[PDB]
């Protein structure tokens, strides 16, 4: 057979930068892919250089009447001191929930075994699962036995 | 004439752990440090051989 080494054309024209970390997005397209166990490639795909910020950076989202967590996942204030994975990310705030009344979690112990695998991302061209996207470990206070 | 020779060598090694020693800022034993302090700056085969 005839081996084929990769050969990419020049990168696409320059783009704008507005993330306060100005870096010209210069993407390229590999016009010829490798085959028959040849050389995969030599050069990197992306190239980030100096850029002139023109548009203003987007400010953070408004956390209105919501208890802010260590990450920033703003949820309703009713979840404070619920005796469970309220924020579902970390237990930073915790509302100093020492006296947890109203029977937290109603003695429900075990969740589904690996529901995180179903909640995890999925790729179609590779057939391999990806990272978790939907946080199913949360409960919202409504215990469903 | 008949000759038969066999070498049935079976070597088995089970790696319990793989350790790596640090390279910088190594704290030596007090005895070795004393011995190093007891070495003169002039070349002396006896003390160095003892060490």
């Amino acid at each position: 057979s005839s081996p084929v080494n990769c050969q990419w054309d020049f990168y696409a024209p320059w783009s704008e930068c507005n993330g306060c970390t100005k870096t010209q997005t210069r993407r390229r397209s590999v016009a010829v892919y490798g085959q028959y166990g040849g050389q995969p490639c030599v050069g990197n795909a992306f190239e980030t250089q100096s850029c002139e910020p023109t548009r203003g950076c987007p400010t953070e989202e408004g956390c209105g009447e919501r208890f802010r967590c260590f990450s920033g996942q703003c949820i309703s204030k009713s979840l404070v001191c619920n005796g469970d994975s309220d924020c579902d990310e970390d237990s930073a705030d915790e509302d100093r929930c020492e006296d947890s009344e109203r029977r937290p979690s109603c003695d429900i112990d075990k969740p589904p075994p690996n529901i995180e695998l179903t909640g995890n991302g999925y790729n179609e061209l590779t057939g391999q699962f990806r990272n978790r996207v939907i946080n199913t470990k949360s409960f919202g206070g409504q215990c469903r036995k | 004439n008949e000759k038969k020779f066999i070498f049935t060598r079976i070597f088995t090694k089970v790696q319990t752990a793989h350790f790596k020693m640090r390279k910088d800022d190594i704290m030596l034993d007090e005895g070795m440090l004393q011995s190093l302090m007891e070495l003169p700056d002039q070349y002396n085969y006896g003390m160095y051989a003892k060490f």
């Binding site: 084929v4 028959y36 995969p40 490639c41 953070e60 589904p112 690996n114 061209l125 | -």
Partner: protein, 191 residues
């Protein structure tokens, strides 16, 4: 003068996807083609005790962008980025593989996934055990330059290519051309 030749090669590759019990069915394939009933029941109990969430339906991931700073703009840009990701390394770029092999793209390298009981560089050797009908199927070509948004329609025009139907296999299934509505910068960034 008498000469006799004996040659018999039997190989098995069980796939038991029961975390610990998965290896039992794979190891039991040595000299035992038929699966053990008790071992099969144990593996079934293990699979009951541990889910296999694979084989489920999918949805566009970019739809989950609901409440974030610049939510709609980020969702539209993720739409465009997913389109570019899908068409930048689509299997159309790779050359067709021999013996009906399926090609994939891992970075900047094509890989001809060979059918079972086959091997080789481009799935050419080991055609002893096919167990299939045979032939050469059709493969969709890479999408051409997108439409210039004359009236909003699309101009993909996916047509046949260098792997035509030759061995009597079925042609590439799907639409020949596509039609949509140009976003017009997504309604000038949402009104």
């Amino acid at each position: 003068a008498a000469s006799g030749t004996q040659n018999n090669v039997l190989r098995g590759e069980p796939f038991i996807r029961g975390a610990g019990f998965i290896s039992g069915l794979s190891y039991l394939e040595l000299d035992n083609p038929a699966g053990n009933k008790r071992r099969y029941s144990a593996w079934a109990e293990s699979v009951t005790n541990l889910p296999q969430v694979i084989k489920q339906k999918l949805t566009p991931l970019y739809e989950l962008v609901k409440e974030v700073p610049c939510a709609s703009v980020k969702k539209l840009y993720l739409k465009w980025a997913l389109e570019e990701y899908l068409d930048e390394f689509d299997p159309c770029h790779c050359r067709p593989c021999q013996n009906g092999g399926l090609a994939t793209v891992e970075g900047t390298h094509c890989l001809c996934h060979c059918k079972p009981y086959t091997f080789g560089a481009a799935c050419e050797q080991g055609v002893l055990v096919g167990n299939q009908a045979g032939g050469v199927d059709g493969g969709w070509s890479c999408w051409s330059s997108w439409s210039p948004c004359v009236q909003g329609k699309k101009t993909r025009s996916r047509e046949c290519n260098n792997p035509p139907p030759s061995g009597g296999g079925r042609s590439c299934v799907g639409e020949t051309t596509e039609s949509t509505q140009c976003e017009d910068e997504e309604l000038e960034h949402l009104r």
